[PDB]
Amino acid sequence: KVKLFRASEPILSVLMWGVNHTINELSNVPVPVMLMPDDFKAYSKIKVDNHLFNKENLPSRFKFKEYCPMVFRNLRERFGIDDQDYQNSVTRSAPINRFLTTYDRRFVIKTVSSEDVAEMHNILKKYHQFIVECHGNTLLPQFLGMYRLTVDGVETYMVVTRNVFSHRLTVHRKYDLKGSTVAREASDKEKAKDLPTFKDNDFLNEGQKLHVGEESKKNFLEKLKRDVEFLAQLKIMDYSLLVGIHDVDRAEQEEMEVEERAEDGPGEFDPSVDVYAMKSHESSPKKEVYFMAIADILTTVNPEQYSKRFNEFMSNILT
Amino acid sequence: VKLFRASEPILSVLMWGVNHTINELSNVPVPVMLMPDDFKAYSKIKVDNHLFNKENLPSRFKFKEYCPMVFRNLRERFGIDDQDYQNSVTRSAPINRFLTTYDRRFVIKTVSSEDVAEMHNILKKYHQFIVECHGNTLLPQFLGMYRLTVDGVETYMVVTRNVFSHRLTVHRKYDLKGSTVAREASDKEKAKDLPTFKDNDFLNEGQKLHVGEESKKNFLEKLKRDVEFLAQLKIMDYSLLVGIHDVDRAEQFGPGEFDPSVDVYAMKSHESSPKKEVYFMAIADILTPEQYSKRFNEFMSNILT
Numbered sequence A: 001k002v003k004l005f006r007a008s009e010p011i012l013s014v015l016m017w018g019v020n021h022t023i024n025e026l027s028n029v030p031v032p033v034m035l036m037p038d039d040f041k042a043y044s045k046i047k048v049d050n051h052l053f054n055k056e057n058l059p060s061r062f063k064f065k066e067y068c069p070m071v072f073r074n075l076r077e078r079f080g081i082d083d084q085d086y087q088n089s090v091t092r093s094a095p096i097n098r099f100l101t102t103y104d105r106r107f108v109i110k111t112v113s114s115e116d117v118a119e120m121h122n123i124l125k126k127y128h129q130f131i132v133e134c135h136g137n138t139l140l141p142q143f144l145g146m147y148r149l150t151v152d153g154v155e156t157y158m159v160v161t162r163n164v165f166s167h168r169l170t171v172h173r174k175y176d177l178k179g180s181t182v183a184r185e186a187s188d189k190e191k192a193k194d195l196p197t198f199k200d201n202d203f204l205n206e207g208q209k210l211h212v213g214e215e216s217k218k219n220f221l222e223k224l225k226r227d228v229e230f231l232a233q234l235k236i237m238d239y240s241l242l243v244g245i246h247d248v249d250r251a252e253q254e255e256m257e258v259e260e261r262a263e264d265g266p267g268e269f270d271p272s273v274d275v276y277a278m279k280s281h282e283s284s285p286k287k288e289v290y291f292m293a294i295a296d297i298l299t300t301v302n303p304e305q306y307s308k309r310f311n312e313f314m315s316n317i318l319t
Numbered sequence B: 001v002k003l004f005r006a007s008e009p010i011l012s013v014l015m016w017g018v019n020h021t022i023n024e025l026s027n028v029p030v031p032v033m034l035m036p037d038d039f040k041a042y043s044k045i046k047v048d049n050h051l052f053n054k055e056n057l058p059s060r061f062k063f064k065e066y067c068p069m070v071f072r073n074l075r076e077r078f079g080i081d082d083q084d085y086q087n088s089v090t091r092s093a094p095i096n097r098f099l100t101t102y103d104r105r106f107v108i109k110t111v112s113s114e115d116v117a118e119m120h121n122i123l124k125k126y127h128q129f130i131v132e133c134h135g136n137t138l139l140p141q142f143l144g145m146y147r148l149t150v151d152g153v154e155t156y157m158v159v160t161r162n163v164f165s166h167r168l169t170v171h172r173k174y175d176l177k178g179s180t181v182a183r184e185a186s187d188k189e190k191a192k193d194l195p196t197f198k199d200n201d202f203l204n205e206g207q208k209l210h211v212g213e214e215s216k217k218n219f220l221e222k223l224k225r226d227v228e229f230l231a232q233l234k235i236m237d238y239s240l241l242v243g244i245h246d247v248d249r250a251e252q253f254g255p256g257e258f259d260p261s262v263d264v265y266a267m268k269s270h271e272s273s274p275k276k277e278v279y280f281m282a283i284a285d286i287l288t289p290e291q292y293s294k295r296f297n298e299f300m301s302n303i304l305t
């Protein structure tokens, strides 16, 4: 039951230690009837200066700050994430590859700028209220924690989200879509990578389509509508639709080759866990799973119109 | 769900501190041996909580634990489980400086900076002696040592295993130095319910302690090595805290019943003893030579028949 907080970088150990630390302290804090306004300006801060002690994995000296912990605890709850699960995902083993995933691929940890952290505060009261009135049903990023780590006098800002992708199903192709009239494509650099991040004209040029079926398309499009309208209400623009594609047969084969090396359920998922996943329509050219979520809402044409434009595009991404 | 609700913020910080450090230690491997650095080591944490978790805790505070690996090892060598130690401190506010945990198992004494220095001074040798005697000793048993910073004020604390029983009411206590001077209770002191008597008011009482010549064997075999250890360390002016539980009295879950592994210092009255009693006996207040050692030793050998 010993947790060592062992990691490739001291930053990771401190991250593991702080999530572990704060989740445990929160376990000693009654769950409130409601969130008070201060909760939105609140934060916790701990500074550690150990001497000749417990220095194998943690640095002797570091700081950890959690923004607005009462609010994020509540967000986790409304997103149906149990605090102990969250803690275990982060601390049972070092997050792996600034962009990390928890070792079990449930949670994504992004290193952000100070400005990003500033925007979360700005948007936080309304985002919460919006998560309340849409019952956690949303294509928006789902925020679970915000933290500032300090190691060797250096401050690092981090935001934890639920993975847009499945924690279990492989992605075989992703796109970052915006719907911009501007040319959007992948550099020769990108296309050369393993899992390139294709863009608008790649999607349009490939003739790609996402066969989800009318009932999913409608539910999807109703989410997209209020999400982008909510974002337009704030001063927010230039976010993307992150699209991941999972080829069910290709995976079955990949798995089969995986076991072969040892010797020598099929494209389904828990919609409560892989929250952005959608099956293909029974009459799809091939058996697929899609993951679709709005990306990057923190960091001519104005907002209101973007939501209008962004919206028309994603409505045409599918059938 | 522990709130750390207490009469006083210092106590809340203490409860929070022991909780925090014991949890942290449960993530630290038990080593194959203590190292010299473990005797100069510490943990420090500073807390700054804006608009968060203020119901019982101050928003800002510090908690420092001295030599946490050595005290964790001492706990084990005394047969104390970390989880219990933690539970005794945090389950409920320690009560009435001189506190005990809510279950009276552990004593919490405010002490001075010089005290904390003195402890660092004797600690390696004290530990070594605890090892060599397999935890069996009338010396105080030190379970942890802490410094608290609250409202800008630093406070030092040492935790010991309670000398008296955690259940058995003590009816009379004597502080015994074996001195050749005038040590008696003061008129005002002689007033309150729990009078701290001394040598003279004891030797002039004809009071003996009946444990047998057998328990006197164990006890005196113990006391000698202890006062010896203190001498070699050139320490003195320490007392023998003695407690007396009158069975019949309390009677007016059984009378005189107790768990020897928890009430480590308690001794049953002998069979042939006049009244039915339980005695509690340990050395106290040694944070500070031969003559005192041998003088002390004899005045104590003269109360066990």
Ligand SMILES: Nc1nc2c(ncn2[C@@H]2O[C@H](COP(=O)(O)O)[C@@H](O)[C@H]2O)c(=O)[nH]1
Binding pocket: A040, A041, A042, A114, A115, A117, A118, A121, A122, A148
């Ligand atoms: N709106 C808002 N912004 C904050 C708050 N706390 C910190 N920030 C912003 O977050 C960034 C980093 O804050 P730090 O916690 O490093 O002081 C800064 O850009 C800071 O202005 C807050 O309570 N409200």
Ligand SMILES: Nc1nc2c(ncn2[C@@H]2O[C@H](COP(=O)(O)O)[C@@H](O)[C@H]2O)c(=O)[nH]1
Binding pocket: A118
């Ligand atoms: N650190 C910190 N930064 C804040 C706080 N409240 C607001 N800010 C910062 O204040 C700025 C707002 O300033 P304005 O642009 O309205 O003059 C934001 O960029 C954000 O960085 C706070 O409580 N703490």
Ligand SMILES: Nc1nc2c(ncn2[C@@H]2O[C@H](COP(=O)(O)O)[C@@H](O)[C@H]2O)c(=O)[nH]1
Binding pocket: A099, A101, A108, A110, A162, A163, A164, A165, A174, A197, A242, A295, A296
């Ligand atoms: N597994 C996973 N990858 C992501 C997620 N969000 C973005 N990525 C990927 O990470 C890369 C950079 O992230 P971004 O700049 O959007 O933060 C992109 O190639 C994108 O496909 C996510 O939620 N989960």
Ligand SMILES: Nc1nc2c(ncn2[C@@H]2O[C@H](COP(=O)(O)O)[C@@H](O)[C@H]2O)c(=O)[nH]1
Binding pocket: B039, B040, B041, B113, B114, B116, B117, B120, B121, B147
């Ligand atoms: N000998 C010794 N004394 C210490 C050590 N740590 C703290 N002390 C002493 O204990 C007292 C309290 O120290 P503070 O922890 O308040 O800085 C001071 O007299 C200090 O010098 C140590 O590692 N060794």
